[PDB]
Design a protein around this ligand. Structure first.
Ligand SMILES: */C1=C\C(=O)NCCCC[C@H](NC(=O)[C@@H](NC(=O)N[C@H](C(=O)O)C(C)C)C(C)C)C(=O)N[C@H]1C(C)C
Lengths: 243, 196, 233, 244, 204, 250, 244, 222
């Protein structure tokens, strides 16, 4: 009877603990990340924490390029993060092949979400402890942010944050938008949108950053790319000469 | 069909006629036998179209997934996938494919995949029905590390001839330049290459 | 504690142990002692055959896998049959396909990987038998000790089974001596009978009780029983 | 409640996988092994405890090669270690066969990574009881990698695992600091022998046997090879000297 | 050799004024040998009629199949199937055997109970649907029938007239075919009643 | 690997109850309210778009879905379960009907189909029932309009009007009072909006509400012309703007 | 492994009982009552609609009486969903019998097949039984009017009068008290309703809470007929039998 | 069968004849060879009739589901890819030769698929036994940038070429216009240049002409 907490079956409350515990694992990395929509780009900032001196910093990342246009940032342990990445990449290539056009960020999300839903209903598949944020500049929808979770849920956002201090970053952003009245950063260049993201990431977390404390990803028309220590540095210097 | 790939000083150039016939009837006079499997890795298709197209389509998909996981693939690797498909299914395929791609370290490379599904890397390769008529010509005019212009001429002449003699070839000559400077489409019309 | 982590091999104990595997290893200790040792020209096996009644036979402990390879078992007889039989196929396949004698070192790697498979998949059970494989190949004489855990090790000599520790210490002591017993099988064998009598207690090795096997340079793996071993008791 | 540690794919209420965690135990309990990424390759070394004088010396080799350019060393349940390498070998072979080019260290890493992570997904399987340090040289340099039973792995400048994992990590970090410009393959072999000798103190009870192997662009032509004979003794000495 | 020419037989449907008609011969023979003079090739499920020409065994089978299908259909849909729908069922049924078809040429005739409209349709052996507003022909004597119909036929014939027309087409076409005849039956279908008559014809 | 869960996860307890199905229904209770009303010339279904963050865009998510061009569905329970149920219900409509008869399935049968799917997730090996209840509304030539409710047990029944989820008891009572066998579609739409307001805490407008109908044929929504017998879909989701207009006459 | 969550739905109790079959039955005891009475000239099926509402669209509803064949129908008691799954396979089985023999499936034959399917979930599979019990009412030319009953166990038996669902014991007593071999359909129709009337857990026995069906051979024909009364038809017969 | 495709300045049009045949006999004097894959993607098919129909519906059915799942308009390249991979899977055994066209979010498109699975792309295409007659007309009057009307004439003229000059083609001209901004307009029997002349005599028989053996009424009501 008390195994309704070991596998994905209902509890009398009508809950799925294993799904909840899955969510719990997503913070295991203690990294926060947020995504904002530019005028015609989409940026995703994520914290980067490489404590060990023996680690090769360059190999550490929770940002992935699923396709030329879709990028994905994962909040959760890395081994589950990579299992998810790979599957999405495959799902992306197959889609192109079968339908003759690049899989739209939102569709990729829906497909991964449906995939998660299954681990939610089938007993032998454990959910993946990760929250996936997919970003792109859809050829039909414009800048896009779609996030999925271990529950098999997903939705599109004007912007979004994930991780331990998720709530601080969220409300920070919510406020910025209640103010601007628009659903996006009214900026033409992505560098400024990147700076905006990094800025509020600082305001909300009340912390200063160095080129190596961040990880940035940008999605533009027909291409998604990640910045470099230097690309970021130059960006950090920018916010500095405004404060 | 008349298709060739020539490596030169700045990279590589692919060329082809635009005629696809079904018997003596020209089903398409503006065909594009130059197919793109990757950014700077293209191929020349000869043999069954249903087959070379299906093979190409599958290759592009494999190189796309490859990239997603391990970054840009080498021109060699591209030849390798084509070969794998052609060799492994040699009994149900009629595809003669030339694979050409520009690399930064390797510059230009050309792999020809004949009917048996074997692979051959060469300075340049010709293929298709019209190719037979230009073996002597191409052998007597090709040189290594020609300039972009010399090479566009070499291809323009060779194919104009093959188009001349082979009825299964014709229409316009299409080329695709692959160099560090990017990818460039070139087209030449009858009126131009005929009187060469 | 242990009771909640030994219901199958697909479970780790809070300390990193695989009990089901350990229980299997136990079956070996409960098994009749058997000794293995080698020089540079030969490898030898000596085993104590255990019988049920005095009306029953003594169960075979040594099995031949090829003309150059064989082993002795301690533990679940059936499992030795399964494993030896599988080791026979591998030697066989090595010949038929490459016209090459399966090196002892490789036979071991094979056994290890076979065992390992029964310790990570649900429904499977480890093998409850220990093996001592001797063999002469392109690199000389060899001795291997196979543990159900999958751990296969190459040694100069060793023993396994009840009271095995006796013989093992004896060999560990006699080392520099028997390792040089080249060009003389009878000597290597007597050193083997000595090592094993070091694990006696109940009785003393008799003719229909002692079992010896030997492989070497120009010696195809051959087993000796009864009257044949008389000259060593 | 409790019992969240009896099945492999179960999430404890705090979001953990105890089975995997219990696996790590089996690892830490194992022998120590390291990896040092020099400026054009990688060096691998391992601690081989001599349980008795009976073990034929130089015989029970631990370090394994995958293909011809990759090296693997692991601490923990050896059989699980081999099992993993077998898969890596098939994995590498499958790769080469289709893309011709011998599998890139990174790609190989994730190949082993996805496989291992796969064993934390079902209750019908047990996680790997090993941590693996592996790497080699490829189209763009050398790479050192360490893989945990959880399936997690990252690129390291230096890596260690097992009993003496701390002493090592301690020494490896010292190197990293006193060599910002890089270490040479030749030097990494020496330093490795030392670092193994030091890490052997958390097991100073049983005598051991050193085993080094390297893959250097300039030293082994990008091929993985075992350090033997003279160069080996030379390192054993450089270590034996600094251990006093 | 040619399956569709082992047993013989023919069927033809015709539309009229608020009525449809379908008729067939009664021959069933093996090559030249005449065997049965009572093999009807027209069946019905509810108010929908189906005539099947071709290999008798497949004719029999296809009927047994459609009965089975139409029965379950009624249990689940809680109504009798309509001609238009049935036609679709028949089509997909055949095409399902695309690379190993039943050697038949099915003719569907009926009046849509809800629209009152008359309906007829033919299919090739793999389902290709031919929905004619005038007439549909099938059988070893299909050419003769086309010639008969293309001339004889005229729109909105009253039931009594359409009967004469369909009978003459069937009858005369059948006589020019060695594998057809040996008796015939004609169905005159209306919204309310359906009359079945057996014609008198040559027996050679 | 290999799903070794080849046994039922939903079994009979000594009391004769089927735990998981009961718990599944509990999950439905917890979910946002949604209702359905059948008028003499249409059907209406609606629910509340409970935006789970002001940053999330509720449009990029529909609780009301088109199954066929004349059948729509809405739920109460676990959103993700509904999602996959919709896809399945859309496919099953083709695979088991349109591909055989060349026409879309009639409401009762498509419903019957979905029911079966759920029924199976109640007995098959290694799975849990679906944590949702569905309200399917549609129209077909020989059955007119209809409204059905499908439960995680796999049971379903026809309704003149009804609601599920949170304030179902309340809303169900409010409907018994306002429903009659003479309601025009616009009437039901009104009653719908009223019945909904009660279960709504904060904002109540076209951006927080999601409602669709199954009324007359929308040829304007066909996409092409030239074929007499093709008149357009009867299913139509109302726009935010369309909702607010009606809310003023509330 | 997975054995940890296996209910073993198909084992014997120390008393030689089948847990799930027992429990399944327990479930059925709470289902609307279904009664079947067999008279010399026809059979009657009456059942009580469990849970109803003002809003429940009763004309379009069916939760207890299902048509299987043209000469066979069943009354259900238990999980409707489960019932359907079985009813559909029953409907198919009938057709196959027809397709193979060109004759209408004999009542008992259909009933045996259905029972066998149930029996199976009872002996192997590890799945739960169907929470359903059937009252089969049918007619064939070999045994004429027949009345059968089957339940989760997989066993089936014939009856003159029988009931399933809730308060069966109460109903059985009442039927056993007023049934007579020379009854007539009409008589049975009354006895049926009277019984429900006396067992109903509800206030009054109204038409909106019933489902009725009769298998009679309309003399002015010679063929048997299945009639599944419509709401109004029940409302009438209800006033007639004196229950207004 | 004569089917053609012709792109114009803001869309694409496809036309076809209406004659169906089995040997030298006309099976259907007016069948429709224009298939709808999605509201704005239509396919014109030649070859084995049943096949053009079944394959057309199959990919259609899937295009529909996919559209619902992706919440996006169907794209011509999707039907092209789906069709071709299907036809190729069937080693040409599914005798379908199609000209697929339509407009979607990416623009207006015109392709052709051959039973073996290869595809072509152009501004004008023709397939079927009238392919050549039609193509002659096209090669003679097509020009870049045609107005919707010019295109419809050209297309319709090509189909005529086939009707008149090809024995495998005849009857009417069916057209379907897919203009980038609007709804697709399918014009069934846009041209009916082959109406049979009134027959010389009426062949209505005098009742009683046919000799009847037996008679009876049939029971349809269960
Ligand atoms: C376009 C003309 C064309 O492409 N080819 C002319 C040959 C006939 C093709 C097609 N006719 C039919 O499909 C027939 N049925 C059959 O051909 N059945 C085949 C047979 O019995 O040999 C089987 C093997 C499929 C008609 C009766 C349906 C045709 O008319 N094609 C036209 C166009 C596509 C309607």
């Amino acid at each position: 009877a008390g195994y309704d907490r070991h596998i994905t079956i209902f509890s009398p409350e009508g809950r799925l603990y294993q799904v909840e515990y899955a969510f719990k694992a997503t913070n295991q990395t203690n990294i926060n990340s947020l995504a904002v929509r530019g005028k015609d780009c989409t940026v995703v900032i994520s914290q980067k924490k490489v404590p060990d001196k023996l680690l090769d910093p360059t190999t550490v990342s929770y940002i992935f390029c699923i396709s030329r246009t879709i990028g994905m940032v994962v909040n959760g342990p890395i081994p589950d993060a990579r299992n998810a990445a790979l599957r999405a990449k495959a799902e992306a290539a197959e889609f192109r092949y079968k339908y003759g056009y690049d899989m739209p960020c939102d569709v990729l999300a829906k497909r991964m979400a449906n995939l998660s839903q299954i681990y939610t209903q089938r007993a032998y598949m454990r959910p993946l402890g990760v929250i996936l944020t997919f970003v792109s500049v859809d050829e039909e929808l414009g800048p896009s942010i779609y996030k999925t979770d271990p529950a098999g849920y997903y939705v599109g956002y004007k912007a979004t944050a994930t991780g331990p201090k998720q709530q601080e970053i969220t409300t920070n952003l919510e406020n910025h938008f209640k103010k601007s009245k628009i659903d996006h950063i009214n900026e033409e260049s992505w560098e400024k949108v990147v700076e905006f993201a990094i800025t509020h990431m600082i305001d909300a977390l009340g912390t200063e950053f160095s080129k190596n404390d961040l990880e940035v990803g940008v999605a533009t028309k027909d291409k998604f790319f990640t910045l470099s220590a230097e690309n970021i540095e130059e960006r950090l210097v920018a916010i500095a000469e405004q404060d | 069909t008349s298709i060739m790939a020539v490596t030169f000083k700045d990279g590589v150039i692919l060329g082809a006629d635009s005629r696809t016939t079904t018997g003596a009837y020209i089903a398409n006079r503006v065909t594009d036998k130059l197919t793109r499997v990757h950014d700077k890795i293209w191929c020349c298709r000869s043999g069954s179209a249903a087959d070379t197209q299906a093979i190409a389509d599958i290759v592009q998909y494999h190189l796309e997934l490859y990239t997603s996981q391990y970054g840009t693939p080498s021109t060699e690797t591209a030849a390798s996938v084509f070969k794998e498909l052609c060799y492994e299914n040699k009994d149900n395929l009629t595809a003669g494919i030339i694979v050409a791609g520009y690399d930064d370290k390797n510059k230009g490379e050309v792999y020809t995949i004949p009917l048996g599904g074997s692979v051959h890397k060469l300075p340049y390769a010709i293929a298709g029905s019209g190719s037979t008529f230009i073996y002597g010509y191409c052998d007597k005019n090709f040189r290594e590390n020609m300039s972009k212009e010399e090479t566009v001429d070499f291809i323009k002449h060779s194919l104009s001839q093959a188009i001349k003699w082979d009825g299964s070839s014709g229409g316009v000559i299409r080329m695709v330049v692959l160099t560090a400077a990017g990818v460039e489409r070139l087209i030449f019309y009858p009126d131009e290459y005929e009187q060469l | 504690f242990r009771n909640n982590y030994d219901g199958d091999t697909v479970t780790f104990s809070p300390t990193g142990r695989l009990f089901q595997v350990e229980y299997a290893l136990e079956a070996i200790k409960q098994g009749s002692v058997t000794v293995g040792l080698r020089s540079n020209t030969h490898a030898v096996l000596v085993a104590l055959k255990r019988n049920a009644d005095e009306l029953s036979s003594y169960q075979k402990k040594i099995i031949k896998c090829d003309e150059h390879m064989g082993l002795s078992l301690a533990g679940l007889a059936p499992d030795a049959r399964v494993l030896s039989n599988y080791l026979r196929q591998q030697c066989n396949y090595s010949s038929l396909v490459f016209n090459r004698k399966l090196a002892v070192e490789r036979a071991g790697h094979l056994l290890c990987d076979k065992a390992q498979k029964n310790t990570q998949s649900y429904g499977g059970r480890p093998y409850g038998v220990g093996l001592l494989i001797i063999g002469y190949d392109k690199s000389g004489a060899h001795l291997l000790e196979f543990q159900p855990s999958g751990n296969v090790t190459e040694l100069y000599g060793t023993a396994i089974g009840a009271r095995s520790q006796g013989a093992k210490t004896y060999l560990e002591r006699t080392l520099d001596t028997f390792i040089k017993i080249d060009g003389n099988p009878d000597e290597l064998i007597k050193a083997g009978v000595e090592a094993i009598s070091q694990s006696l207690r109940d009785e003393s090795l008799t003719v229909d009780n002692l079992s010896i096997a030997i492989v070497g340079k120009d010696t195809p793996f051959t087993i000796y029983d009864g009257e044949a071993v008389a000259k060593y008791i | 409640g409790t019992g969240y540690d009896l099945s492999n794919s179960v999430f404890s209420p705090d979001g953990r996988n105890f089975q995997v965690e219990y696996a790590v135990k089996a690892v830490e309990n194992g022998t120590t092994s390291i990896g040092i990424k020099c400026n054009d390759g990688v060096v691998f070394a391992v601690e081989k405890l001599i349980t008795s004088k009976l073990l034929v010396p130089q015989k029970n080799v631990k370090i394994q090669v995958v293909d011809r350019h990759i090296g693997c060393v692991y601490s923990g349940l050896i059989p699980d270690g081999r099992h993993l390498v077998n898969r890596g070998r098939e994995e590498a072979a499958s790769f080469k066969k289709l893309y011709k080019t011998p599998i890139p260290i990174p790609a190989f890493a994730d190949r082993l990574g996805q496989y291992v992570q796969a064993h934390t997904l079902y209750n019908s399987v047990r996680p790997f009881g090993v941590s693996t340090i592996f790497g080699g040289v490829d189209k763009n340099g050398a790479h050192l990698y360490m893989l945990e039973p959880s399936g997690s792995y990252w690129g390291y400048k230096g890596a260690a695992t097992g009993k003496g994992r701390q002493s090592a990590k301690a020494e490896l970090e010292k190197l990293v600091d006193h060599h910002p410009e890089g270490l040479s393959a030749r030097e990494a072999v020496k330093q490795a022998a030392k670092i193994i000798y030091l890490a052997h103190e958390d097991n100073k009870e049983k005598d051991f046997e050193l085993e080094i192997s390297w893959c250097s662009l300039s030293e082994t032509n990008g091929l993985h090879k075992f350090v033997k004979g003279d160069l080996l003794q030379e390192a054993i000495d450089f270590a034996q000297k600094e251990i006093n | 050799s040619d399956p569709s020419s082992i047993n013989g037989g023919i069927v033809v449907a015709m539309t009229g004024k608020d009525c449809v008609a379908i008729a067939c011969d009664l021959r069933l023979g093996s090559q030249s040998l005449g065997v049965s003079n009572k093999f009807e090739k027209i069946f019905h499920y509810g108010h929908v009629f189906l005539g099947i020409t071709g290999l008798a065994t497949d004719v029999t089978t296809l009927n047994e199949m459609f009965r089975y299908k139409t029965n379950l259909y009624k249990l689940k849909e809680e109504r009798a199937i309509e001609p238009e729908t049935f036609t679709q069922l028949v089509s997909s049924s055949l095409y399902e055997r695309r690379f190993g078809p039943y050697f038949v040429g099915p003719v569907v005739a009926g009046i849509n109970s809800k629209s009152g409209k008359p309906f007829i349709a033919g299919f090739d052996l793999i389902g290709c649907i031919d929905e004619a507003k005038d007439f549909i022909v099938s059988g070893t004597a299909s050419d003769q029938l086309f010639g008969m119909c293309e001339s004889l036929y005229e729109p909105n014939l009253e039931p009594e007239d359409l009967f004469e027309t369909i009978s003459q087409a069937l009858l005369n076409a059948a006589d020019r075919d060695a594998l057809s005849g040996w008796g015939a039956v004609v169905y005159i279908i209306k919204k309310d009643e359906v009359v079945k008559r057996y014609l008198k014809m040559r027996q050679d | 690997m290999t799903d070794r869960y080849s046994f039922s996860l939903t079994t009979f307890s000594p009391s004769g109850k089927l735990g998981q199905i009961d718990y599944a229904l509990t999950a439905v209770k917890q979910g946002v309210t949604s209702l359905g009303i059948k008028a003499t010339n249409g059907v209406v279904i609606a629910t509340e778009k409970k935006s789970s963050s002001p940053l999330a865009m509720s449009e990029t998510l529909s609780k009301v879905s088109l199954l066929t061009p004349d059948i729509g569905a809405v739920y109460s329970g676990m959103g993700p379960d509904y999602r996959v149920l919709v896809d399945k219900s859309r496919k099953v409509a083709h695979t088991s009907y349109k591909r055989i008869y060349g026409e879309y399935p009639p409401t009762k049968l498509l419903v019957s189909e979905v029911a079966k799917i759920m029924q199976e997730a109640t007995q098959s090996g290694g799975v849990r029932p679906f944590g949702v209840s569905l309200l399917i509304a549609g129209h077909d030539e020989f059955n007119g309009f209809s409204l059905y409710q499908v439960d995680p047990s796999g049971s379903y029944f026809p309704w003149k009007a009804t609601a599920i989820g949170k304030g179902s008891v309340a809303a169900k009572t409010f409907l018994e009072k306002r429903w009659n066998d003479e309601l025009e579609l616009e009437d039901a739409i009104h009653i719908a909006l009223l019945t909904l307001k009660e279960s709504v805490e904060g904002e109540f407008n076209g951006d927080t509400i999601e409602l669709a109908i199954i009324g007359d044929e929308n040829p304007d929504l066909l996409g092409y012309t030239g074929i007499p017998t093709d008149k357009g879909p009867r299913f139509r989701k109302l726009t935010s703007q369309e909702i607010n207009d009606r809310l003023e006459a509330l | 492994g997975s054995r940890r969550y296996d209910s073993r739905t198909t084992i014997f109790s120390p008393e030689g009982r089948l847990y799930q079959v027992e429990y399944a039955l327990e479930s059925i005891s709470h289902a609307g009552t279904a009664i079947g009475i067999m008279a010399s000239d026809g059979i009657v099926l009456a059942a009580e609609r469990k849970v109803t509402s003002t809003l429940l669209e009763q004309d379009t509803s069916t939760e207890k009486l299902y048509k299987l064949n043209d000469k066979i129908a069943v009354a259900v008691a238990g999980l409707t969903a489960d019932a359907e799954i079985l009813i559909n396979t029953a409907r198919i089985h009938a057709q196959n019998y027809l397709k193979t023999y060109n004759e209408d499936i004999p009542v008992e034959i259909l009933v045996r097949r259905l029972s066998d399917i149930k029996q199976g979930y009872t002996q192997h599979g590890g799945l739960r039984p169907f929470g359903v019990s059937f009252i089969y009412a049918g007619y064939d030319d070999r045994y004429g009017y027949q009345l059968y009953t089957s339940n989760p166990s997989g066993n089936y038996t014939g009856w003159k009068a029988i009931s399933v669902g809730a308060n069966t014991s109460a109903a059985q007593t009442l039927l056993q008290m007023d049934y007579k071999d020379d009854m007539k359909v009409d008589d049975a129709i009354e006895l049926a309703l009277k019984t429900l009337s006396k067992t109903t857990d509800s206030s009054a026995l109204t038409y909106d809470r019933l489902e009725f069906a009769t298998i009679r051979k309309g003399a002015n024909d010679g063929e048997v007929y299945q009639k599944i009364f419509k709401p109004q038809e029940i409302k009438d017969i209800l006033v007639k039998t004196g229950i207004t | 069968t004569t089917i053609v495709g012709v792109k114009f300045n803001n869309g694409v049009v496809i036309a076809a004849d209406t004659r169906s045949t089995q040997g030298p006999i006309v099976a259907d004097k007016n069948c429709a060879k224009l298939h709808r894959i999605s509201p704005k993607i239509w396919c014109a098919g030649a070859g084995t009739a049943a096949d053009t129909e079944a394959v057309t519906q199959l990919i259609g059915s899937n295009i529909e589901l996919h559209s619902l799942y992706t919440s996006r308009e169907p794209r011509v390249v999707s039907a092209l890819q789906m069709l071709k991979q299907h036809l190729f899977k069937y080693q040409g055994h599914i005798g379908a030769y199609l000209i697929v066209a339509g407009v979607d979010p990416t623009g207006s498109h015109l392709f052709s698929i051959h039973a073996h699975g290869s595809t072509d792309v152009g501004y004008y295409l023709s397939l079927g036994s009238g392919s050549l007659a039609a193509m002659a007309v096209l090669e003679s009057h097509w020009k870049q940038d045609l107005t919707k009307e010019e295109a419809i004439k050209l297309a319709s003229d090509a189909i005529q070429a086939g009707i008149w000059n090809d024995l495998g083609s005849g009857s009417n001209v069916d057209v379907c216009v897919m203009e980038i901004g609007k709804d697709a307009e399918y014009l069934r029997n846009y041209l009916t240049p082959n109406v049979r002349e009134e027959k010389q005599k009426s062949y209505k028989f005098p009742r009683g002409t046919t000799a009847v053996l037996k008679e009876s009424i049939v029971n349809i009501c269960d």
